[PDB]
Design a protein around this ligand. Structure first.
Ligand SMILES: Nc1ncnc2c1ncn2[C@H]1O[C@@H](COP(=O)(O)OP(=O)(O)OP(O)(O)=S)[C@H](O)[C@H]1O
Ligand SMILES: Nc1ncnc2c1ncn2[C@@H]1O[C@@H](COP(=O)(O)OP(=O)(O)O)[C@H](O)[C@H]1O
Lengths: 578, 116
């Protein structure tokens, strides 16, 4: 074993092992397990960057230090150098005789415990040479007999794949759940390790920089657990401090340097890591009101809800907001969503829910179950969000979706996250969810019977309440009802459409001047309360685009030119010569 | 033991992947009597998988012991547990391990959890 295992107690004695910070109950449970006559091999199961191996070293520390009960005190914990044993490759030869010599030494020394890091190498495998397969068979009886004790270390995903697949181990090993440490513990870990970073980079860190690395990393870096993400921030700040200021060589790293690395590590703007886009938010109300006309209460309701979330009033685990838009057709319920994402400078992730009417949508949005082609995808939704954690997410015409999509939505609205079918998860805390529906467009054309007409309209919202059950509705921030467009709005609508026509004409060298009377005339011709603005587009196309097309192709506007439109007393469009 | 685990490749890949194929004809002739070992869900997928074994083995339904039987198995081994841990358990403690475990262990059967 002398060239196969490392005496961890010796590392603790020489200084290879540092004292563990916190984790008192983790060490106590490992010893409670080791002392059992059945199922006495503890396994540390967790996630990368939480101290799983630091804890096993930490136990050797306490065994040496004298911080454990006399039963454990002075026992010896050794790690297993898997690489050294596998290196025997040519082969065994010495692989098997030395492994057996190890077991004989350990069997004889019942005061010996092995620590096996990266336990999934052997358990559920052993495939590294195959030598670990019968090595496991020669370990199992000694774990059972109480001759050899083993402390393992793996992750949750491997645990299920390696230990839950073998009854012999299910009956021999005890899982211990290892979570990340606290903010204070993380700072203590960094300060414990710190001289190793300062010496490496020829930098020094302030106390504040260390605290900031831990807290800023939590706020913006959502990829890892605290020990490592905060350490990476410290190391990255160290690395840039020794790199960037070639002409200045500032030696001390402060919180300002931490903010710059957190912004880059976290993929967020260098401004946003600290200073918010207060002006972007202040200007949403006006920028959106200048694009979609007539929906003033709707724009404000959306804008205010976003601001409250951005002001920090709400829950940190939830999406930025969740709103269902509804109303008559041709009113801008999708147009405003598109403009929202532009106004905020945020990429729009868009799904047409009419493409998910079947029972085969889960397999696309979440990912196919393992064994199915497409299980390899993280889900179209999951992947879009992971790539773009800051996003406006639009689910167009949600009422057409197969009902299973609602379970996906309910989970996200409650926890801010969606896992894939492989282990990754999307973080929706930075996206805005907008769903639209046309349930509320249902209406009639029939009037009352009598000489004097009266308004016989029904109560809007009933069409939503009957489709979307309370579980869904009660999790929305709101339902924004959009109204019908008025005639004043139509005049504004005509103007934006005339502008679009001019842009197309500029490309051909043609200048179009429509008179005010002509505009008032078109506005009247296209007004239809029940069809929103879509008829205005038709009216403009029919009255202006049509004769222009003939001239552009066959006549006077081939080489560019001047076009104007006057209104006749006869209500004709007196188009201009050229 | 764990006959449902050799259905893949014998002890491990690279060994007797055909161990089952060698066993089928000896069982059919009755050369070696074989005692199988499967679980409730494993049986329906391991023996029913191949008629050459499904039609050879007889199914015995094994269920857990009762509260007093759990106490009896603890008492059977009690001297060992006491010797093993240099402790003594009261009669009440043994009964409590069983009587209380059924209210808290929930998912694993009682016979082992009361012992744990
Ligand atoms: N209130 C408005 N002000 C300015 N432009 C608008 C307005 N409403 C719609 N538009 C334009 O935006 C397009 C139609 O948009 P939407 O009404 O949002 O389509 P939609 O969201 O899919 O809703 P429906 O019910 O399916 S028609 C057309 O280009 C125009 O009608
Ligand atoms: N409270 C803590 N104090 C010191 N180190 C900690 C603490 N929590 C987690 N760690 C880290 O736990 C260990 C995680 O990595 P380690 O155990 O060395 O190997 P592995 O990458 O296989 O898990 C590190 O030693 C250490 O940085």
């Amino acid at each position: 074993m002398e060239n196969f295992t490392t005496n961890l107690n010796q590392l603790a004695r020489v200084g290879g092992i540092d004292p563990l910070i916190g984790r008192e109950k983790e060490l106590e449970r490992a010893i409670q397990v080791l002392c059992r006559r059945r199922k006495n091999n503890p396994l540390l199961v967790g996630e990368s960057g939480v101290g799983k191996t630091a804890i096993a070293e930490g136990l050797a520390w306490r065994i040496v230090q004298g911080d454990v009960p006399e039963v454990m005190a002075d026992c010896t914990i050794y790690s297993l150098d898997i690489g050294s044993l596998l290196a025997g490759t040519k082969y065994r030869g010495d692989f098997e005789k030395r492994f057996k010599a190890l077991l004989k030494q350990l069997e004889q020394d019942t005061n010996s415990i092995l620590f096996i890091d990266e336990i999934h190498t052997i358990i559920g495998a052993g495939a590294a040479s195959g030598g670990q397969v019968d090595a496991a068979n020669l370990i199992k009886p000694l774990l059972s007999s109480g001759k050899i004790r083993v402390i393992g270390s793996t992750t949750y995903q491997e645990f299920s794949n390696i230990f839950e697949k073998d009854r012999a181990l299910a009956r021999r090993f005890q899982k211990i759940d290892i979570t990340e440490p606290s903010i204070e513990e993380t700072v203590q870990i960094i300060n414990g390790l710190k001289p190793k970073y300062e010496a490496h980079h020829d930098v020094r860190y302030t106390a504040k920089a260390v605290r900031a690395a831990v807290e800023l990393a939590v706020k913006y870096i959502n990829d890892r657990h605290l020990p490592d993400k905060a350490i990476d921030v410290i190391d990255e700040a160290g690395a840039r401090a020794r790199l960037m200021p070639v002409s200045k060589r500032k030696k001390t790293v402060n919180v300002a340097d931490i903010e710059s690395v957190v912004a880059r590590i976290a993929r967020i703007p260098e401004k946003s890591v600290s200073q918010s886009d207060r002006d972007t938010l202040k200007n949403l109300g006006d920028r959106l009101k200048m694009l979609v006309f007539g929906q003033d209460k709707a724009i404000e309701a959306l804008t205010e809800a976003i601001k409250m979330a951005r002001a920090g009033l709400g829950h940190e685990h939830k999406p930025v907001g969740s709103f269902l838009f509804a109303g008559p057709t041709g009113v801008g319920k999708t147009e405003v969503t598109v403009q929202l994402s532009k106004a905020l400078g945020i990429e729009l992730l868009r799904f047409d829910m009419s493409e998910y009417m079947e029972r085969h949508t889960v397999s696309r949005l979440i990912g196919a179950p393992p064994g199915y082609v497409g299980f390899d995808q993280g889900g179209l939704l999951t992947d879009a969000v992971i790539k773009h954690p800051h996003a406006v997410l639009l689910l167009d015409e949600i009422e057409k979706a197969h009902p299973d999509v609602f379970n996906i939505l309910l989970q996200v609205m409650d926890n801010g996250t969606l896992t894939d079918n492989n282990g990754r998860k999307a973080d929706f805390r930075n996206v805005v969810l907008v769903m639209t529906t046309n349930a509320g467009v249902r209406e009639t054309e029939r009037k009352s019977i009598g000489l004097i007409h009266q308004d016989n309209s029904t109560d809007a919202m009933e069409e939503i309440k009957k489709i979307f059950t309370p579980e869904f509705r009660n999790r929305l921030d709101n339902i924004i009802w959009f109204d019908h467009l008025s005639t004043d709005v139509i005049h504004q609508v005509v103007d934006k459409f005339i502008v679009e026509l001019q842009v197309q004409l500029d490309q051909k060298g043609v200048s179009l001047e429509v008179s005010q009377e002509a505009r008032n005339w078109l506005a009247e011709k296209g007004y239809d309360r029940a069809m929103g603005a879509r008829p205005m587009a038709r009216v403009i196309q029919d009255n202006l685009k049509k004769p222009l097309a003939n001239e552009l192709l066959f006549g006077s506007l081939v080489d560019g030119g001047q076009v104007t439109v006057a209104l006749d007393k006869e209500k004709n469009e007196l188009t201009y010569g050229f």
